[PDB]
Amino acid sequence: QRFMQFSSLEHEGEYYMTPRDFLFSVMFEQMERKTSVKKLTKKDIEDTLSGIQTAGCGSTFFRDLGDKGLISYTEYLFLLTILTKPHSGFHVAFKMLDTDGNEMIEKREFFKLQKIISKEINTTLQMRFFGKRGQRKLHYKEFRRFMENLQTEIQEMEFLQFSKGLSFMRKEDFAEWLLFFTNTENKDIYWKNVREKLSAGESISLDEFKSFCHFTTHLEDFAIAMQMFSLAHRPVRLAEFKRAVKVATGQELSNNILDTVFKIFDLDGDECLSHEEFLGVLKNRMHRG
Amino acid sequence: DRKVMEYENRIRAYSTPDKIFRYFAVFMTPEDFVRSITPNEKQPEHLGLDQGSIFYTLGECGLISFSDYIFLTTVLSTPQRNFEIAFKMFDLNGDGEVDMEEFEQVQSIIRSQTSSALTTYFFKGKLTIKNFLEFQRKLQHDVLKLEFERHDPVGRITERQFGGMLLAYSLTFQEVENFFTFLKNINDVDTALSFYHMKVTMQQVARTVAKDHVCDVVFALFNKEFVSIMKQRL
């Protein structure tokens, strides 16, 4: 919540961050910079329109924007809530904020929808959702296609950054990615198994990593699916894990990913998954701090 | 006078299903079963230590025996999503259809969260959850009807007591079952009120999140705390 760390623009004491800064805010715990905070010029606010005019509507919006954009602190919290909170509690504010007819939220209610969750000038998000002057309404469908595109963006650039630029990330690389935020007591054990008990190499793809990421972002059901076994003590073996991923998310998971997950969280289990451990790591992965 | 009421509630909450059956009962009746389910309703002085509705389609017009009681209570107390998963985790392609062995495995894992003439109906074959969830919804609709079908139908009017089914634990009947249909998918009716927070503020939530008549009998009692007892009521 001290997003001041990355904000490079200032205006009369209000600090704003460009899309580049917002991306550094999620891929970098810190960096060697001092951010050189500069007064907001009469070009940056124009560069906002410039950026959204040349940027693309897909997975690449925040990246094509580069520095041509603006993000306000409340909108930064809004975007972090998009990344961090599950895909089940945003359709409750649209229908509640657009009762006239179907769910379309006006520009004046976007500030409300932000002051609700996790709570001067127009920024990239306003200009993209409601147009250059506010004449457009934010359909819930377009906003869902936006939410998951931002998610896909962070997935792709984390893929490349942990794969160190190779087309395929290693199983040891996927292990690095999964454990990147876990700092708990068993931090050592997890890293023991990565190095002592894991068949190295073997070509995890970007589509497969996207599969695991979508599974992480649809894990609410996997919890109670797994909170069955914990109660009425009953084990969770490789077939149980496969079927539970299926019911929670409706998708196969490549055998590299499954082998990695088990070889990391078969804590003294003998082909049995320490699953509360695994869910703990997965929830460390969701909120980055 | 009322020491036995509070004692019976004590049985209804902290006692074994064996005891909750041996007191509230030799299978019970649809009138009896709701007594164990409904707190603050006494059984007669000749009650003690063995002292077309859904029920008919379990035995033969009212029969509710230990096995039926055990399994039938775990269907009004379990939510929707909690059932499907147990169904999808033991089927053998993972679509939601279970058979006698798999549905035997499902109740073991579903009942353990706590501290028979019907095997023929559901199945030999295999049963899906699209249909099972209907069995649950029917069980509820029928038991709710009976519970509020005797309280004073005189056909509801009651007013002053209707609050009391709201505080069972913790103008018609169709208006009531709709207050309980609104009332049940409630989690989002907490987040809607919590966004509206951070009395026709909600009468649209009943039509936008739950999807004016009864809205008056409730606001005269206490929102945002309303929700707590309502949720902890099932």
Author numbering:
A (entry chain B): 88 to 206, 229 to 398
B (entry chain A): 108 to 132, 145 to 170, 192 to 255, 276 to 283, 288 to 318, 320 to 335, 359 to 386, 393 to 405, ...
Give sentences from the paper.
Mitochondrial calcium uptake proteins 1 and 2 (MICU1 and MICU2) mediate mitochondrial Ca2+ influx via the mitochondrial calcium uniporter (MCU). Intriguingly, humans have three MICU paralogs (MICU1, MICU2 and MICU3), as well as an alternative splicing variant (MICU1.1) depending on the tissues, and human MICU1 and MICU2 generally assemble as a heterodimer and regulate Ca2+ uptake of the MCU complex in most tissues. In particular, it has been reported that MICU2 functions as a gatekeeper of the MCU for suppressing the cellular damage caused by excessive mitochondrial Ca2+ influx.
1(a) and 1(b)]. Unlike MICU homodimer structures, the MICU1–MICU2 heterodimer comprised two interfaces, interfaces 1 and 2, as a result of the asymmetry of the heterodimer. Therefore, the interfaces of the MICU1–MICU2 heterodimer contained a rigid interface 1 and a variable interface 2. Compared with the homodimers in MICU1 and MICU2, only structural differences in the interloop (L6) of MICU1 EF-hand 1 were observed in interface 1 comprising MICU1 EF-hand 1 and MICU2 EF-hand 3. The primary interactions between MICU1 and MICU2 were two salt bridges involving the highly conserved side chains of Arg221(MICU1)–Asp330(MICU2) and Asp231(MICU1)–Arg352(MICU2) [Figs. 3(a), S4 and S5]. In contrast, the other salt bridge, Asp231(MICU1)–Arg352(MICU2), has never been observed in other MICU homodimer structures. Notably, the Asp231(MICU1) was located on the interloop (L6) of EF-hand 1 participating in the Ca2+ coordination, indicating that Ca2+ binding induces structural changes directly on interface 1.
